[PDB]
Design a protein around this ligand. Sequence first.
Ligand SMILES: NC(=O)c1ccc[n+]([C@@H]2O[C@H](COP(=O)([O-])OP(=O)(O)OC[C@H]3O[C@@H](n4cnc5c(N)ncnc54)[C@H](OP(=O)(O)O)[C@@H]3O)[C@@H](O)[C@H]2O)c1
Ligand SMILES: NC(=O)c1ccc[n+]([C@@H]2O[C@H](COP(=O)([O-])OP(=O)(O)OC[C@H]3O[C@@H](n4cnc5c(N)ncnc54)[C@H](OP(=O)(O)O)[C@@H]3O)[C@@H](O)[C@H]2O)c1
Ligand SMILES: OC(O)(c1ccccc1)C(F)(F)F
Ligand SMILES: OC(O)(c1ccccc1)C(F)(F)F
Ligand SMILES: [Mg+2]
Ligand SMILES: [Mg+2]
Lengths: 288, 290
Amino acid sequence: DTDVTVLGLGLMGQALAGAFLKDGHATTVWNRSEGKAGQLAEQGAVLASSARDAAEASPLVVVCVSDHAAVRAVLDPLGDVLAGRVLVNLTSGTSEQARATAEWAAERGITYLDGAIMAIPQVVGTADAFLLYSGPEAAYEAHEPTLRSLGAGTTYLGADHGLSSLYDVALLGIMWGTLNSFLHGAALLGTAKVEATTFAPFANRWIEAVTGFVSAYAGQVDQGAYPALDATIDTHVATVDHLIHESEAAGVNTELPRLVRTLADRALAGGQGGLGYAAMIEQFRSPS
Amino acid sequence: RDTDVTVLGLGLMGQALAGAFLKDGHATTVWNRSEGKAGQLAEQGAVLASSARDAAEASPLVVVCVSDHAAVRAVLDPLGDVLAGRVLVNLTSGTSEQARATAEWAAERGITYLDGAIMAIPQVVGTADAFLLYSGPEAAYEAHEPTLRSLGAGTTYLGADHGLSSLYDVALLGIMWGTLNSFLHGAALLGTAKVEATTFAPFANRWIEAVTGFVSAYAGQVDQGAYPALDATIDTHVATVDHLIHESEAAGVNTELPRLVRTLADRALAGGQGGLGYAAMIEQFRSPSA
Ligand SMILES: NC(=O)c1ccc[n+]([C@@H]2O[C@H](COP(=O)([O-])OP(=O)(O)OC[C@H]3O[C@@H](n4cnc5c(N)ncnc54)[C@H](OP(=O)(O)O)[C@@H]3O)[C@@H](O)[C@H]2O)c1
Ligand SMILES: NC(=O)c1ccc[n+]([C@@H]2O[C@H](COP(=O)([O-])OP(=O)(O)OC[C@H]3O[C@@H](n4cnc5c(N)ncnc54)[C@H](OP(=O)(O)O)[C@@H]3O)[C@@H](O)[C@H]2O)c1
Ligand SMILES: OC(O)(c1ccccc1)C(F)(F)F
Ligand SMILES: OC(O)(c1ccccc1)C(F)(F)F
Ligand SMILES: [Mg+2]
Ligand SMILES: [Mg+2]
């Protein structure tokens, strides 16, 4: 008998199991492919022979596989064994997928939490890891002390199982937006032989300033009123052109700032050049 | 009146620059092309010059913050003699080429010149969190840093090439648009589930702070040209990019951002780089689209 089971031992599942073990929890693990549990076994994990055996070992069963199709493949034969345990699904997917698994679980009397890991594997188990959970509040509250091994930023969103996925994809969008523009900046700076590691601390200090703009612009989005207290969209677009021109002169890719300019051009066509950047929200509300 | 610092250009940003100099006790002369922008500044003790030439003559340090390079040239071209013996600081946005052109103009005339970038909004200027970047002669930066620091404790020197400030500036501003656009898309998506943008924001900001750890790690990989998937493979990324596209389509919101993310990542996939870390995406930014 163990405290927690982890099903799926990819890069992330391995970190999940490792964090549970670091905090002293008796942990059972299983993976479809043999040979991914070596380090975990040395740390004290129990290697279950089968997914069914693994599920039977613990009152809390955590799944972290590639996608919804994998989740269904692992879970579909475990409907009997999972009854009366709490199943926690940390696999990425859509709100629709999460609601489908929630319906599957409810038909079978399995209490279900659907979560999103807002961390990389190396940050799991530390104070900086953040994780979001949706489903029954009482099940979250009953298992939170154990789930908190995965990160101090463990947080409950609400009863609708799909919420975790909705927040997750919205947040992941920000990751790509920030990383892609960082990489474009590094490519541009690399033409002047500025190393990416030289640029990074400037990028990160600036990103910290940008979080203040996020908070201010969020208030403006909630009002539907976008005064240019800092800078007008017209002022922004003049600098977008500088980025385009600088990139062209350096011979690097310009797809990112070209899309920025295209989207801002729609606001300008709507007469919003004199408003603050938060007015751009109107360009994201509907398809082009 | 003899003053410590002159500000030419009293837009939203110029007003904040002049205000910060005044807050720190510096005698400040101001000028703007259009009359009537300086009322609040005058009440704070700014001296309102009648002309740009009079303003430039009042101080040993002259700061310009106008719309663009064309405006800078319009203001400065007649001041080549007046600027003799003074240090000119240009905080106007522009390209590295424009900065080097103004630097050449200044050098022909013996005007010591610093080219800077304001990595802050007007309300943050004059606080400890404001970040500003300067390029040009190190000795001139060192001589005027105590006064320049009135604009922000994050005042920093980049190097001797005057164009560096602009190169860093546009690279950094790209990050601002990338982050803000994706935040606004996320807010639009969450709004369909009745989540307010102000509810989402603290989650976005906590996550953005985690992403800075990825920036630092990936930068090291960029400098090595080696991109092992220590966290997640590009294949794993693209599966979540599709979730974002599908979620956005189901919610009826715009999908242009994640579609471009997918397009760019598909180029890495076509090159066989699905099993590498996301830092390998640097190769998609090095050259024009084919
Ligand atoms: N890595 C990260 O930074 C990170 C961060 C946040 C969220 N996540 C999410 O966490 C999940 C796992 O990612 P990862 O990085 O651990 O991926 P990974 O290294 O690709 O692991 C995928 C896992 O899914 C299993 N799997 C795939 N298809 C299966 C099937 N048909 N039946 C049973 N098991 C199957 C794999 O088993 P085999 O070993 O047998 O192939 C493996 O355990 C993904 O949803 C991902 O988006 C990852
Ligand atoms: N606002 C921000 O958050 C921010 C942040 C960082 C950097 N910046 C940069 O700071 C600079 C100023 O931005 P801002 O927000 O202050 O813009 P702004 O409010 O639009 O001000 C533009 C300024 O330039 C002057 N100007 C324009 N053309 C001129 C010319 N031919 N001759 C003389 N003066 C001229 C204007 O004078 P009039 O009043 O007579 O038109 C005004 O003082 C821009 O390069 C901008 O990108 C701004
Ligand atoms: O790019 C900008 O619009 C900007 C806004 C906010 C903070 C820094 C820069 C500007 F054009 F004003 F520089
Ligand atoms: O979106 C992801 O690639 C990811 C990577 C790093 C941190 C969070 C999420 C994943 F697909 F893995 F979820
Ligand atoms: Mg070269
Ligand atoms: Mg090397």
